[PDB]
Design a protein around this motif. Structure first.
Motif, PDB file in Angstrom:
ATOM      1  N   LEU A  63       4.456  -9.270  59.230  1.00 24.75           N
ATOM      2  CA  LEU A  63       4.617  -8.327  58.290  1.00 24.75           C
ATOM      3  C   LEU A  63       5.491  -7.449  59.208  1.00 24.75           C
ATOM      4  N   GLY A  64       6.235  -6.387  58.873  1.00 24.09           N
ATOM      5  CA  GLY A  64       6.890  -5.313  59.505  1.00 24.09           C
ATOM      6  C   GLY A  64       7.317  -4.209  59.105  1.00 24.09           C
ATOM      7  N   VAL A  65       7.671  -3.174  59.934  1.00 22.77           N
ATOM      8  CA  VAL A  65       8.406  -1.988  59.490  1.00 22.77           C
ATOM      9  C   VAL A  65       9.636  -1.914  60.048  1.00 22.77           C
ATOM     10  N   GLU A  66      10.919  -1.917  59.457  1.00 26.97           N
ATOM     11  CA  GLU A  66      12.011  -1.880  59.945  1.00 26.97           C
ATOM     12  C   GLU A  66      12.795  -0.407  59.980  1.00 26.97           C
ATOM     13  N   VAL A  67      12.736   0.098  61.280  1.00 24.57           N
ATOM     14  CA  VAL A  67      12.923   1.596  61.307  1.00 24.57           C
ATOM     15  C   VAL A  67      14.648   1.468  61.844  1.00 24.57           C
ATOM     16  N   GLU A  68      15.283   2.690  61.864  1.00 24.98           N
ATOM     17  CA  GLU A  68      16.685   2.969  62.009  1.00 24.98           C
ATOM     18  C   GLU A  68      17.207   2.790  63.157  1.00 24.98           C
ATOM     19  N   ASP A  69      16.496   3.099  64.277  1.00 21.27           N
ATOM     20  CA  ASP A  69      16.779   3.114  65.801  1.00 21.27           C
ATOM     21  C   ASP A  69      15.801   2.744  66.745  1.00 21.27           C
ATOM     22  N   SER A  70      15.977   2.511  67.934  1.00 15.80           N
ATOM     23  CA  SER A  70      14.945   2.163  68.943  1.00 15.80           C
ATOM     24  C   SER A  70      14.337   3.418  69.343  1.00 15.80           C
ATOM     25  N   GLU A 114       4.872  -5.833  63.239  1.00 16.43           N
ATOM     26  CA  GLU A 114       5.894  -5.268  63.947  1.00 16.43           C
ATOM     27  C   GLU A 114       6.762  -4.078  63.579  1.00 16.43           C
ATOM     28  N   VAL A 115       6.863  -3.092  64.338  1.00 17.28           N
ATOM     29  CA  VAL A 115       7.731  -1.856  63.949  1.00 17.28           C
ATOM     30  C   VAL A 115       8.968  -2.243  64.879  1.00 17.28           C
ATOM     31  N   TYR A 116      10.246  -2.254  64.057  1.00  9.66           N
ATOM     32  CA  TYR A 116      11.345  -2.918  64.866  1.00  9.66           C
ATOM     33  C   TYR A 116      12.665  -2.472  64.404  1.00  9.66           C
ATOM     34  N   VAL A 117      13.634  -2.469  65.478  1.00  9.18           N
ATOM     35  CA  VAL A 117      14.882  -2.181  64.845  1.00  9.18           C
ATOM     36  C   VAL A 117      15.878  -3.330  65.342  1.00  9.18           C
ATOM     37  N   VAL A 118      16.794  -3.734  64.474  1.00  7.61           N
ATOM     38  CA  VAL A 118      17.638  -4.595  64.783  1.00  7.61           C
ATOM     39  C   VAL A 118      19.011  -4.343  65.422  1.00  7.61           C
ATOM     40  N   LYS A 119      19.181  -4.684  66.668  1.00  9.62           N
ATOM     41  CA  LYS A 119      20.326  -4.029  67.677  1.00  9.62           C
ATOM     42  C   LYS A 119      21.487  -5.026  67.474  1.00  9.62           C
TER      43      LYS A 119
END
Ligand SMILES: O=[N+]([O-])c1cc([AsH2])ccc1O
Ligand SMILES: [Cl-]
Ligand SMILES: [Fe+3]
Length: 119
Positions: A63-70, A114-119
């Motif tokens: 599972l995860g939380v996608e945030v806006e930036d690093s 995971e709390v994560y941003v895609v770069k």
């Protein structure tokens, strides 16, 4: 403006892409053997389908939380560490056809987040 991530280990990726296209009314954002994703506007959702090698049934991969930036990833890391959770941080880390900054925790029953941003 973050969203929930839901990564599923599916037995039939092709059947699954089919089903989620109908359920959400939109095609996948990305397709590569053994992997697909959908970026859904309403509800806000990143749906990750990973093809399992011969399981009988769909099960949770993570599972995860996608945030806006690093920047947000690092706030989340510090806050989770401060609340007493065991954390694992990753930076500029390849993986599933993307590069990500992430922090990982695991719930008491073993489900990974995971709390994560895609770069
Ligand atoms: O937990 N992970 O690191 C993980 C990462 C990716 As990319 C796909 C599946 C997984 O279980
Ligand atoms: Cl499950
Ligand atoms: Fe993933």
């Amino acid at each position: 403006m973050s969203r929930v991530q839901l990564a599923l280990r599916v037995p039939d990726l092709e059947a699954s892409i089919g089903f989620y296209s109908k359920l959400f009314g939109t095609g996948p954002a990305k397709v590569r053997p053994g992997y697909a994703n959908f970026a859904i506007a309403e509800p806000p959702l990143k749906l990750v389908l990973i093809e399992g090698a011969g399981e009988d049934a769909t099960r949770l991969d993570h599972l995860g939380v996608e945030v806006e930036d690093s920047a947000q990833v690092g706030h989340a890391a510090r806050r989770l560490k401060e609340s007493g959770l065991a954390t694992v941080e990753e930076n500029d880390t390849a993986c599933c056809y993307a590069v990500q900054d992430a922090v990982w925790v695991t719930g008491p029953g073993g489900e990974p987040w995971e709390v994560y941003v895609v770069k």
